[PDB]
Amino acid sequence: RAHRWPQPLPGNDRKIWFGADYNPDQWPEDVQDEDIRLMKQAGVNIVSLAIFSWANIETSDGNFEFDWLDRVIDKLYKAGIAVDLASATASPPMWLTSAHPEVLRRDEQGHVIWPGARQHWRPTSPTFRTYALRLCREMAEHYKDNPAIVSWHVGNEYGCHNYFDYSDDAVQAFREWCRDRYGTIDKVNAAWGTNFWSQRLNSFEEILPPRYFTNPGRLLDFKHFCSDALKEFFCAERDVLSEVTPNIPLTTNFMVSASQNTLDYDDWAHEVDFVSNDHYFTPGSWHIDELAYSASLVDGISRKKPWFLMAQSTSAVNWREINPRKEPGELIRDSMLHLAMGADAICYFQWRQSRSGAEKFHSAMLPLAGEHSQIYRDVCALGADLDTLSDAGILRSKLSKARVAIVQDIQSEWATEHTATPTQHIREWTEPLDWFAAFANRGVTADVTPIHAQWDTYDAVVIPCVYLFSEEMAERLRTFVRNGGKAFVTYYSALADEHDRLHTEGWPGLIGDVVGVRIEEHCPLGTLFPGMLDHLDVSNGTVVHDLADVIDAIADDTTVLATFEADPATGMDGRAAITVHPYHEGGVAYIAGKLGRDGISQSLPEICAALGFELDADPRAGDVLRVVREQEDGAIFEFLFNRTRNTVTADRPAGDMLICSLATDSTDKVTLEPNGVLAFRR
Amino acid sequence: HRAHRWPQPLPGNDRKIWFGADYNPDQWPEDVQDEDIRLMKQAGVNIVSLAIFSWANIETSDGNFEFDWLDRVIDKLYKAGIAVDLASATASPPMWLTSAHPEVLRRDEQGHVIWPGARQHWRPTSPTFRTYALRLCREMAEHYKDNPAIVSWHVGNEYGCHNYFDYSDDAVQAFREWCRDRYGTIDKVNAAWGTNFWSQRLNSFEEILPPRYFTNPGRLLDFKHFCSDALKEFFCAERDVLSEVTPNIPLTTNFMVSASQNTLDYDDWAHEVDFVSNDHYFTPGSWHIDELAYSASLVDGISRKKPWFLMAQSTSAVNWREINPRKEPGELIRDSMLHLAMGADAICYFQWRQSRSGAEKFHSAMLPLAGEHSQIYRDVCALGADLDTLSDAGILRSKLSKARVAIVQDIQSEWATEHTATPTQHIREWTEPLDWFAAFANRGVTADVTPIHAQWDTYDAVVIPCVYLFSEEMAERLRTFVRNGGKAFVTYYSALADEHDRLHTEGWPGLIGDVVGVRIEEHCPLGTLFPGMLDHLDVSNGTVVHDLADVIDAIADDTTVLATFEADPATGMDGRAAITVHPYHEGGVAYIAGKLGRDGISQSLPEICAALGFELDADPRAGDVLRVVREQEDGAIFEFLFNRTRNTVTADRPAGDMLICSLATDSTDKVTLEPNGVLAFRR
Ligand SMILES: [Zn+2]
């Protein structure tokens, strides 16, 4: 579906968008002039409105009021601040839930989710759909041809909570979903099979949603269904809006992060004009790498098209058990990281910190400390930096193509989440992250690519715990390697087909010819009981934890790079841990256990040399993350990030210094403090 | 603010320190009572509490009340010279009541009916239950009217130990009315609670629902407050029936005051009793002594230095923890003495006789299953003898002396700190005063723990420990206190929000920044939730901050920095102020920018106190023993000494007559206390 970016207010040039969601219907109106003045001072050129404002718009059934919203849009418009308008359907009013409790979601035991909870509505509720679609229409009619409205923010963060509904509506929708996908009940039974204690289904009317063992095939599809049910609802809403206002681009805010495991966002991405994401930092060592990863993923989801950062935090969030604040410079750096990874818009949640409500301790662009605060000063500096990058022509440039793509796959994640796997300590989502960080440690910025993206055009691909391999997936991987591709393939790859039906005759399934390895069972690892086998040393100085493959046999042309070292009694001593295997013009290395970020990093030079993937032999390669956006004219925008907890010194990129935070430009070398960032144009 | 009335002796008897426990005769055969009574007399037991859970044995069926079994045992107790603290007997309703009226049963957050057999399975706001309860109160009062054995009323039992949170239809309606009464108009409600970013304001009181398992923190604050008020009302209702029929019997209800108690506003409830009574159970380990001393001090603060009643404690182990450690030799006597020293004029246990069955069977008692020939019973006897000795020495009605420093405790600040969307779940209000109590004790200063509405503003110094909620009136008291020469210790997590949990603006601490001399824009929470997370901050005086530090952006020109943080420069905390001191006219303000814990505070106390001009004993042995002092009007002084450490210590002998000693020794020049030892002197 066609890429469509939000366009400037009439009279304005195209700028990197910079703003936050704004909630003036929750403040007295006399506040707005100060907010706007501070917005303009910060370099803020957009705000997102009406997201949770339904009860202030449809104040009673059928009755729509727009006075307050028109007044604030008017003020914002005169200051030159655009409005990313919401469908306002995210959070229904109390009169709606009180008159119509059948729109309220049910949990696994039939407990009604009380209003006041966020997203307490059934995505498959026909009644709620009618109310919501009416509101979309009223909103779209009213703001039709208003030059202040530059995009639609449809709903808000779908499935942040209402992902799992067990109401009657959901039960029927899941049946119909199964009907559309499988046609006949025989094909369903073929897909799901049977739990040993139960028997085949006789009709679609016998299908019930899985609850808290469950049928893994049914659970896989049920998760799939939940994403589709919410996708359909978003599409219905989007379709109402583009009918009335066909020239205003539409989006909804995704929640892409390394561990996100609800929506298939790559699938959802086909239904948006532009991809927008909300990302909040992971505290600690993973702060930089996980943000970089998620941002790389969003761009992969965007097929290297410009995307929109709809939300992040200026400092601490409010929803963890412990909410650390951001360190100095991280506010700007994090924003630059999203930017470098292809964003052409940087927004926050929220503009102004609140004195009450559950979000009161959540940071904002304008903290309770007010205009005289380090955050606000940093927000202003950020606005200036984005303005500077705008003028240097960064807009619409694309995140350059990596030498290696790391495959991410939401469905394999779903499959790995079942409670009867070899171990609960292995999930799909951590392996791609680990590979991203390890390559970064060797000075290689990878592209994180969803499984349906074109990773098979890259020089190399990482296949990290891709549990689910369809035959077509097997062919792409086979074709890729035969034609010269280099592949890194790990444990927990190709265990089953698209229906979670385990492959037979040995693991990895389907692609054993390419990989050159056969596995009959796994060796899970841990400390659950005294004396349990908790780790396996690998012969190259690394250690595997949580799970290792038991490699039974390798092909005659398979080379062993490293073996496991263990007590002989385990049957794992001398067994292959890392292998490399030629397949025509490629190209396949196999990693038989979870090595973690460092273990992979430690193994990378030896694996890469055997595959013929050139690595920088510089031991300082990992010190800084280089992220590069490219224009058609050949202009290159290189961002540099300190990955470490110490000041580093690096060779100066060629070109003009555009931006610097906690960093220093010199003639021969460049200097970045911890959390520092530099941007150059060459 | 109600008039103090202490339970008075049986006719013909002198005033003695009360000593007893709740007694269980409707759960034993009657032929046991003579032996129990004989053993009580031998133990020095002069009082028991009866009928607490005995409703089903009194109103044996709807409308029918029998008192025979109870009249008989009271008679036996009376002839033995043992007084009775009678209960309203309304704590645990009979099954015939819950069966005919399940509408009295509580609902959980999800609407599940709490089944009978759980204790306090009843709705505090049930009108049907209140009528049944008040009928029983009246019957109890009619029947024991003018009975001379009955010296007090034990109204109900430990309100809100379990039934604090009810989500039934009654609670929903009661909470609206509670809100209507407190705010008048829905405009005032919405102004108080604000909005969650995802929802919008209320249009009417009828739209108000109780918060459940994120919530609106302002609403949750008030809901907790409501839950306390709803139970307070029910107690007042019962109390009013009993004092109407028998106006000459003083009434109480048993509180559960301990360092971490977080349900009822007991300071508020204290305004509704004739005398304050408390139930306290020891905290095992290093905190055993200090937490008991703290809790007892608090009761005395709550009681405005008037005598209070220890209604319950354990002789040895309890039964409701995951591991129930037993008491060490001497701890039984010491703990009773610790309560006593902190102002109790009564010492009672749960329970008199250990039971063979029921969930309490492993809970220790005054008379264990092991029987009369047991270490606990021998100890009980020695204690009873010692209380008689202290009675004759004239300790009754003496007051816990006025400390040089008060430590402010605040249930509402605790409530507010309990919300799941704060900077961290590892900071609660309740631990901070406790820490300060222990630290001063480690420097030889017994502090008075004072609830926020007590007169901490008359003391030489005050500790403001995580007092999250600061009203404008609260800010003025502190300002006036310090201006007029008071010395204050103020910590992180103080003055964050107003009384409605609305965060103060322009910087923290709110309102009192002029006094404190420090400005904070945000917090720096600490922990190990993720790898490489910042988990601690070294302080330049050798201490370490955990869980949370303030980010102090700027200080006043007359603010002096005593210690700074030491950290990775990348954190933005390196060299930043950790402990400051600030003159404000004639005071008086030290700021502590993170959680130092007992040892960290204790280490910091000399340098802070020297700067504030608070004189400390330079004796490094100051912490070895806790000195607690009760005072009479005539000038009589009762000084108790408690060993705080795990080794035998030696101290300068107090002046006066040695009255009591357990695991301790009197000598001419020096005094000796073994671990867990206690001495008492009259001077
Ligand atoms: Zn239920």
PDB file of C-alpha atoms in Angstrom, chain A residues 23 25-26 52-56 59 91 94-95 107 109 111 114-120 156 282-286 315-328 349-350 353-363 367-375 377 597 645-646 674-675, chain B residues 109-110 112 191-203 207 209 212 214-217 416 419-426 468 493 496-498 501-508 519-533 547 551 553 568-573 576:
ATOM      1  CA  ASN A  23      -4.206  16.773  26.172  1.00  0.00           C
ATOM      2  CA  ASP A  25      -9.121  18.838  27.355  1.00  0.00           C
ATOM      3  CA  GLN A  26      -7.528  17.804  30.672  1.00  0.00           C
ATOM      4  CA  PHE A  52      -8.465   9.628  24.470  1.00  0.00           C
ATOM      5  CA  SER A  53     -10.966  12.426  24.037  1.00  0.00           C
ATOM      6  CA  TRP A  54     -14.104  10.474  23.005  1.00  0.00           C
ATOM      7  CA  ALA A  55     -16.035  11.315  26.197  1.00  0.00           C
ATOM      8  CA  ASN A  56     -15.315  15.008  25.505  1.00  0.00           C
ATOM      9  CA  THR A  59     -20.473  13.690  25.385  1.00  0.00           C
ATOM     10  CA  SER A  91     -11.164   5.019  24.954  1.00  0.00           C
ATOM     11  CA  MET A  94     -18.738   5.772  30.537  1.00  0.00           C
ATOM     12  CA  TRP A  95     -22.251   6.298  29.159  1.00  0.00           C
ATOM     13  CA  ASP A 107     -10.971 -12.593  30.512  1.00  0.00           C
ATOM     14  CA  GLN A 109     -12.751 -17.071  33.419  1.00  0.00           C
ATOM     15  CA  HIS A 111     -14.671 -11.862  34.345  1.00  0.00           C
ATOM     16  CA  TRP A 114     -14.262  -2.942  34.372  1.00  0.00           C
ATOM     17  CA  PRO A 115     -14.220   0.445  32.595  1.00  0.00           C
ATOM     18  CA  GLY A 116     -11.393   2.663  33.833  1.00  0.00           C
ATOM     19  CA  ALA A 117      -9.084  -0.051  32.568  1.00  0.00           C
ATOM     20  CA  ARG A 118      -7.451   0.886  29.298  1.00  0.00           C
ATOM     21  CA  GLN A 119      -8.785  -0.870  26.170  1.00  0.00           C
ATOM     22  CA  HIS A 120     -11.652  -2.608  27.973  1.00  0.00           C
ATOM     23  CA  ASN A 156      -4.236   4.092  19.983  1.00  0.00           C
ATOM     24  CA  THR A 282      15.214  -0.601  28.211  1.00  0.00           C
ATOM     25  CA  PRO A 283      17.253   0.481  31.244  1.00  0.00           C
ATOM     26  CA  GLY A 284      20.810  -0.808  31.735  1.00  0.00           C
ATOM     27  CA  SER A 285      23.346  -2.293  29.295  1.00  0.00           C
ATOM     28  CA  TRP A 286      20.669  -2.998  26.674  1.00  0.00           C
ATOM     29  CA  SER A 315      13.211  10.515  30.910  1.00  0.00           C
ATOM     30  CA  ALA A 316      11.656   7.833  33.104  1.00  0.00           C
ATOM     31  CA  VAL A 317       8.450   5.974  32.310  1.00  0.00           C
ATOM     32  CA  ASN A 318       5.940   4.968  34.998  1.00  0.00           C
ATOM     33  CA  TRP A 319       4.955   1.341  34.339  1.00  0.00           C
ATOM     34  CA  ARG A 320       7.927  -0.711  35.609  1.00  0.00           C
ATOM     35  CA  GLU A 321       8.680  -2.100  39.057  1.00  0.00           C
ATOM     36  CA  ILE A 322      11.604   0.317  39.010  1.00  0.00           C
ATOM     37  CA  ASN A 323      11.594   3.302  36.620  1.00  0.00           C
ATOM     38  CA  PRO A 324      15.115   4.703  36.130  1.00  0.00           C
ATOM     39  CA  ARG A 325      15.550   8.185  34.703  1.00  0.00           C
ATOM     40  CA  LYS A 326      17.544   8.777  31.520  1.00  0.00           C
ATOM     41  CA  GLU A 327      21.175   9.749  32.022  1.00  0.00           C
ATOM     42  CA  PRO A 328      22.452  13.116  30.646  1.00  0.00           C
ATOM     43  CA  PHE A 349       4.497  11.007  25.183  1.00  0.00           C
ATOM     44  CA  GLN A 350       3.475  13.480  26.460  1.00  0.00           C
ATOM     45  CA  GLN A 353       3.611  16.266  32.744  1.00  0.00           C
ATOM     46  CA  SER A 354       0.460  15.738  34.747  1.00  0.00           C
ATOM     47  CA  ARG A 355      -0.098  16.370  38.495  1.00  0.00           C
ATOM     48  CA  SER A 356      -2.622  13.530  38.820  1.00  0.00           C
ATOM     49  CA  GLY A 357      -3.625  10.275  37.159  1.00  0.00           C
ATOM     50  CA  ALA A 358      -1.596   7.077  36.764  1.00  0.00           C
ATOM     51  CA  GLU A 359       0.822   8.801  34.388  1.00  0.00           C
ATOM     52  CA  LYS A 360       1.807  11.522  36.859  1.00  0.00           C
ATOM     53  CA  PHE A 361       5.318  10.147  37.386  1.00  0.00           C
ATOM     54  CA  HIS A 362       5.798   9.583  33.636  1.00  0.00           C
ATOM     55  CA  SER A 363       8.284  12.088  32.172  1.00  0.00           C
ATOM     56  CA  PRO A 367       8.129  18.441  33.349  1.00  0.00           C
ATOM     57  CA  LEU A 368       6.290  19.541  36.506  1.00  0.00           C
ATOM     58  CA  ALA A 369       9.508  21.390  37.388  1.00  0.00           C
ATOM     59  CA  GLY A 370       8.461  23.540  34.445  1.00  0.00           C
ATOM     60  CA  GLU A 371      10.356  25.600  31.906  1.00  0.00           C
ATOM     61  CA  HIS A 372      13.389  25.776  34.202  1.00  0.00           C
ATOM     62  CA  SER A 373      14.383  22.106  33.997  1.00  0.00           C
ATOM     63  CA  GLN A 374      17.172  20.093  32.406  1.00  0.00           C
ATOM     64  CA  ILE A 375      14.734  18.061  30.312  1.00  0.00           C
ATOM     65  CA  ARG A 377      16.429  22.660  28.060  1.00  0.00           C
ATOM     66  CA  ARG A 597      25.525 -11.476  23.009  1.00  0.00           C
ATOM     67  CA  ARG A 645      30.482   3.439  29.379  1.00  0.00           C
ATOM     68  CA  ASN A 646      33.711   5.319  28.630  1.00  0.00           C
ATOM     69  CA  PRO A 674      29.291   8.039  26.973  1.00  0.00           C
ATOM     70  CA  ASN A 675      25.853   8.478  25.428  1.00  0.00           C
TER      71      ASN A 675
ATOM     72  CA  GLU B 109     -12.102  -7.177  43.461  1.00  0.00           C
ATOM     73  CA  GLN B 110     -13.786  -9.517  40.943  1.00  0.00           C
ATOM     74  CA  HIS B 112     -16.407 -13.328  44.356  1.00  0.00           C
ATOM     75  CA  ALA B 191     -10.257  18.405  40.694  1.00  0.00           C
ATOM     76  CA  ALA B 192      -8.971  16.183  43.496  1.00  0.00           C
ATOM     77  CA  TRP B 193      -8.446  12.960  41.472  1.00  0.00           C
ATOM     78  CA  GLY B 194      -7.518  14.545  38.105  1.00  0.00           C
ATOM     79  CA  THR B 195      -7.677  12.226  35.097  1.00  0.00           C
ATOM     80  CA  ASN B 196      -5.815   9.170  33.893  1.00  0.00           C
ATOM     81  CA  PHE B 197      -4.415  10.177  30.509  1.00  0.00           C
ATOM     82  CA  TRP B 198      -6.603   7.559  28.794  1.00  0.00           C
ATOM     83  CA  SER B 199      -9.907   8.403  30.454  1.00  0.00           C
ATOM     84  CA  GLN B 200     -11.875  11.582  31.083  1.00  0.00           C
ATOM     85  CA  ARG B 201     -13.661  13.304  33.990  1.00  0.00           C
ATOM     86  CA  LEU B 202     -16.712  12.110  35.932  1.00  0.00           C
ATOM     87  CA  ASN B 203     -20.108  13.654  35.247  1.00  0.00           C
ATOM     88  CA  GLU B 207     -20.322   7.233  37.843  1.00  0.00           C
ATOM     89  CA  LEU B 209     -16.574   3.081  41.078  1.00  0.00           C
ATOM     90  CA  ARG B 212      -9.435  -2.354  41.434  1.00  0.00           C
ATOM     91  CA  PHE B 214      -3.307   0.948  36.621  1.00  0.00           C
ATOM     92  CA  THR B 215      -5.739   2.890  38.817  1.00  0.00           C
ATOM     93  CA  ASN B 216      -6.122   6.581  39.496  1.00  0.00           C
ATOM     94  CA  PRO B 217      -3.736   7.233  42.424  1.00  0.00           C
ATOM     95  CA  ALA B 416       0.187   7.293  48.467  1.00  0.00           C
ATOM     96  CA  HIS B 419       0.680   3.109  44.035  1.00  0.00           C
ATOM     97  CA  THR B 420       2.031   0.880  41.261  1.00  0.00           C
ATOM     98  CA  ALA B 421       3.140   3.791  38.999  1.00  0.00           C
ATOM     99  CA  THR B 422       5.574   5.622  41.311  1.00  0.00           C
ATOM    100  CA  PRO B 423       9.261   5.979  40.421  1.00  0.00           C
ATOM    101  CA  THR B 424       9.830   2.615  42.151  1.00  0.00           C
ATOM    102  CA  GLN B 425       8.015  -0.111  44.040  1.00  0.00           C
ATOM    103  CA  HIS B 426      10.973  -0.464  46.441  1.00  0.00           C
ATOM    104  CA  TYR B 468       5.138  12.196  50.593  1.00  0.00           C
ATOM    105  CA  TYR B 493      10.191  11.346  48.972  1.00  0.00           C
ATOM    106  CA  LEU B 496       5.999  15.471  46.610  1.00  0.00           C
ATOM    107  CA  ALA B 497       2.256  15.999  46.405  1.00  0.00           C
ATOM    108  CA  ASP B 498      -0.594  17.700  48.254  1.00  0.00           C
ATOM    109  CA  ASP B 501      -1.805  13.124  45.666  1.00  0.00           C
ATOM    110  CA  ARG B 502      -1.445  15.957  43.157  1.00  0.00           C
ATOM    111  CA  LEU B 503       2.258  16.411  42.550  1.00  0.00           C
ATOM    112  CA  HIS B 504       3.654  19.825  43.540  1.00  0.00           C
ATOM    113  CA  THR B 505       5.060  21.959  40.705  1.00  0.00           C
ATOM    114  CA  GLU B 506       8.116  24.157  39.992  1.00  0.00           C
ATOM    115  CA  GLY B 507      10.331  21.657  41.824  1.00  0.00           C
ATOM    116  CA  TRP B 508      10.689  19.273  44.780  1.00  0.00           C
ATOM    117  CA  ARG B 519      15.570  21.903  44.338  1.00  0.00           C
ATOM    118  CA  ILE B 520      14.837  18.531  42.707  1.00  0.00           C
ATOM    119  CA  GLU B 521      13.448  18.070  39.188  1.00  0.00           C
ATOM    120  CA  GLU B 522      13.347  14.258  39.120  1.00  0.00           C
ATOM    121  CA  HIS B 523      14.359  11.049  40.883  1.00  0.00           C
ATOM    122  CA  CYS B 524      17.071   8.527  40.207  1.00  0.00           C
ATOM    123  CA  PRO B 525      15.611   5.116  41.104  1.00  0.00           C
ATOM    124  CA  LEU B 526      18.098   2.300  41.625  1.00  0.00           C
ATOM    125  CA  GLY B 527      18.010  -1.476  41.239  1.00  0.00           C
ATOM    126  CA  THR B 528      18.915  -4.656  39.404  1.00  0.00           C
ATOM    127  CA  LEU B 529      15.794  -5.133  37.272  1.00  0.00           C
ATOM    128  CA  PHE B 530      17.919  -5.203  34.077  1.00  0.00           C
ATOM    129  CA  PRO B 531      21.605  -6.012  33.488  1.00  0.00           C
ATOM    130  CA  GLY B 532      23.884  -3.013  33.917  1.00  0.00           C
ATOM    131  CA  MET B 533      21.140  -1.031  35.609  1.00  0.00           C
ATOM    132  CA  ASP B 547      16.529   2.037  45.791  1.00  0.00           C
ATOM    133  CA  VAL B 551      18.605  14.438  41.586  1.00  0.00           C
ATOM    134  CA  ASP B 553      19.698  20.295  40.472  1.00  0.00           C
ATOM    135  CA  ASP B 568      30.216   6.837  37.014  1.00  0.00           C
ATOM    136  CA  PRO B 569      30.250  10.338  35.503  1.00  0.00           C
ATOM    137  CA  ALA B 570      27.901   9.012  32.815  1.00  0.00           C
ATOM    138  CA  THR B 571      25.102   8.694  35.372  1.00  0.00           C
ATOM    139  CA  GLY B 572      24.922  12.430  35.874  1.00  0.00           C
ATOM    140  CA  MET B 573      25.071  11.893  39.634  1.00  0.00           C
ATOM    141  CA  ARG B 576      25.844  15.828  43.129  1.00  0.00           C
TER     142      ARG B 576
END
